[PDB]
Design a protein around this ligand. Sequence first.
Ligand SMILES: CCC[C@H](O)CC(=O)SCCNC(=O)CCNC(=O)[C@H](O)C(C)(C)COP(=O)([O-])OP(=O)([O-])OC[C@H]1O[C@@H](n2cnc3c(N)ncnc32)[C@H](O)[C@@H]1OP(=O)([O-])[O-]
Ligand SMILES: CCC[C@H](O)CC(=O)SCCNC(=O)CCNC(=O)[C@H](O)C(C)(C)COP(=O)([O-])OP(=O)([O-])OC[C@H]1O[C@@H](n2cnc3c(N)ncnc32)[C@H](O)[C@@H]1OP(=O)([O-])[O-]
Ligand SMILES: CCC[C@H](O)CC(=O)SCCNC(=O)CCNC(=O)[C@H](O)C(C)(C)COP(=O)([O-])OP(=O)([O-])OC[C@H]1O[C@@H](n2cnc3c(N)ncnc32)[C@H](O)[C@@H]1OP(=O)([O-])[O-]
Lengths: 232, 232, 232
Amino acid sequence: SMSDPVSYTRKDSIAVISMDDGKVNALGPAMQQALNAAIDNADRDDVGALVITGNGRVFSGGFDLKILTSGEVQPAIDMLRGGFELAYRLLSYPKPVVMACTGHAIAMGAFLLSCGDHRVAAHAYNIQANEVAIGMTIPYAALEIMKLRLTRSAYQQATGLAKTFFGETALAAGFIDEIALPEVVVSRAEEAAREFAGLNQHAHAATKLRSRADALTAIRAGIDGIAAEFGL
Amino acid sequence: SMSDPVSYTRKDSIAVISMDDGKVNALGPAMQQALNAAIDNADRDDVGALVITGNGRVFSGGFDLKILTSGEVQPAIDMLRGGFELAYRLLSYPKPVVMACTGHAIAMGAFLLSCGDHRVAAHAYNIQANEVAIGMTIPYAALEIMKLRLTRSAYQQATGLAKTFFGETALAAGFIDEIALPEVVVSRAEEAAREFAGLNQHAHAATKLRSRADALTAIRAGIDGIAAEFGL
Amino acid sequence: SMSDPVSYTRKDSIAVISMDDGKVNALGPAMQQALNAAIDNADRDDVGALVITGNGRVFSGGFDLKILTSGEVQPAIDMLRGGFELAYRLLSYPKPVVMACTGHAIAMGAFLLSCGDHRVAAHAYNIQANEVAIGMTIPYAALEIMKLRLTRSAYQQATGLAKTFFGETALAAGFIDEIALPEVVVSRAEEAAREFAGLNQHAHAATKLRSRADALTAIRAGIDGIAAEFGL
Ligand SMILES: CCC[C@H](O)CC(=O)SCCNC(=O)CCNC(=O)[C@H](O)C(C)(C)COP(=O)([O-])OP(=O)([O-])OC[C@H]1O[C@@H](n2cnc3c(N)ncnc32)[C@H](O)[C@@H]1OP(=O)([O-])[O-]
Ligand SMILES: CCC[C@H](O)CC(=O)SCCNC(=O)CCNC(=O)[C@H](O)C(C)(C)COP(=O)([O-])OP(=O)([O-])OC[C@H]1O[C@@H](n2cnc3c(N)ncnc32)[C@H](O)[C@@H]1OP(=O)([O-])[O-]
Ligand SMILES: CCC[C@H](O)CC(=O)SCCNC(=O)CCNC(=O)[C@H](O)C(C)(C)COP(=O)([O-])OP(=O)([O-])OC[C@H]1O[C@@H](n2cnc3c(N)ncnc32)[C@H](O)[C@@H]1OP(=O)([O-])[O-]
């Protein structure tokens, strides 16, 4: 539901966090708060791993366009900061995080997707930073998230050319780690999550931070520089 | 012709710049001036995108070997600086740049190729930094251009081992973005160019600079350090 | 033999260095000294290229676990420093280095493997940094070695998730450069070595250092920071 856009379900060693706002899982304030609250729940349950899913229509269509373009600056800035804060939180999360990309992932939807330790999508799901196509420059925080995962040549095209990836081209590019049929995307993500929960948690938490140190520092800077993007 | 080695042709939303010196499109002073002048023309026409092609024999065989090895130092330095200046100009160009790799691309030919936003080649076209094979160390400016596009492992082999890439291995390595049959390489490049011209120009110009900032800074330094390569 | 775990054989333009301790080629002090001594021999013979092989069972199972977990700190530190010193030496070696991955390569075995200019393995050979699986954080020196070769997304999974790679997935990830049938892994490595020996040696030595400068600096730092890993 739009009022209640996130569900949380503990399954033995994992927690499944599912976005469904009835529409395209826009990452506005309500959605961000719902996600953060679900993660707090996973912290409380001390689960072995997280799965985050979209709905049957998309993973996420990104930030809420209504807020972004209402003509009020501070709320748009605040929505942007919160989205990238959440990305930071997922990239630094001390448990394995698996993304079940259950539909298209556009812009912030794709940036959020790129925060998972393991990412599962179906062959025909579009993954795209479409900013340049719609006349926006890609924020530094988003650039750093993408640069952490996309091959050097895919990064060039994904950014400057707003290239759309899917299936095998998304896998080769580093926009996803696993392809599965639509009807088993979630099951495959849960399966992967259960396996990762068997890894040593301390070693995983510590190693992932080392493998992402420079990106996380650059993302923190990008979050604090969001206002400057606007020139504000 | 060798005297007139570059043609410029505006086609609606794109400009097609074609190298043909009657030979292997050596990137000597005349060729560099011809290319720069054609780009100035594209600036004047305010086109949506550029396509740059080679001839039916090669994309380019790289710098003019006659000048490089004549035994006169300053002209060789000046040719090298101009080639990498042109590369800098293409990597920072505010319109999408599509390379039609119409034949082999060796050394500076491959470095020039790697300056396109989108690069199209045929299956059997060799793309290779052959410096190490012929007893030269790869200039820092060239290393940075390659590092911007080649995967980490392909970069290692392309440089130290002068590895030759083509077709699928060039695509996987990040030496090209698209493979096409020889007879449609140019058509595919033009088609891609027309599509990219539909992107928001300001957003594209700004985003590509962000996606290349560190490389461009390192390339500027490499251009100013060309003389030092010789130990001069 | 365990007492005599390394053989050295000059073949025309190449030297073949073969690990076989009768077991899993554990990289303890004896093995490290044997390897260094074999390399000194290659220096003396001034060969064109090196091939390093494992045995019929593995490339290497990594550091000696007996020493690592005996409960004596300084010998474990010293073994670790020596392994990464040897890696530094191979990455900076002035002749082409080809690894014949003749069996599985785990942890330091995989890090050692990643020091070759060209790496050949068979389809079913597991290559894995398994540290996180067994509750250890990956040392910075090892992280830098891996980051030099693994694609951005493969690096994430190889480290934080202790992902196992093999065959095509290892090739795509950048854990190897060539796949061959088990019975010709060594022959293919020797063949590649002979070809690389035909490259200009000075240009190769100089170019590989440039292509690895930042990694080598970070690896030197990681070697000098091994004691700190323990918190010692
Ligand atoms: C400045 C830096 C910021 C950062 O970089 C990102 C920016 O946001 S730039 C990136 C900017 N993002 C984009 O330019 C495009 C993002 N969206 C899309 O690409 C497609 O809509 C999507 C593939 C998600 C769904 O395709 P589909 O399945 O064919 O469905 P559909 O297309 O017919 O739309 C369905 C309904 O949902 C609505 N709606 C859609 N998106 C949003 C949104 N972000 N928010 C709110 N609503 C959104 C839409 O209005 C419609 O509502 P209604 O009243 O019921 O008709
Ligand atoms: C120091 C840092 C600098 C930077 O890093 C790069 C350096 O330059 S290092 C890289 C150095 N580059 C190389 O080591 C090799 C570059 N060239 C090649 O790899 C091949 O020639 C190529 C594939 C291009 C064409 O193959 P193909 O189709 O079989 O044709 P072909 O092979 O039979 O030669 C055709 C004709 O063109 C001539 N010619 C060729 N290249 C050049 C040149 N760069 N210039 C002038 N001329 C050149 C050749 O002399 C011949 O002339 P002629 O009097 O009519 O006989
Ligand atoms: C802190 C930072 C350090 C750095 O990051 C790396 C660390 O070391 S973390 C990484 C830590 N490494 C690991 O967690 C695992 C590494 N080893 C393996 O993954 C597998 O053993 C391997 C695939 C190599 C062989 O499989 P297989 O063919 O089925 O054979 P097998 O499995 O049945 O064992 C055969 C025999 O060799 C023995 N032995 C094995 N490894 C070692 C060793 N490293 N040393 C000494 N011995 C070793 C084993 O005890 C056995 O002896 P025995 O008395 O005759 O029974």
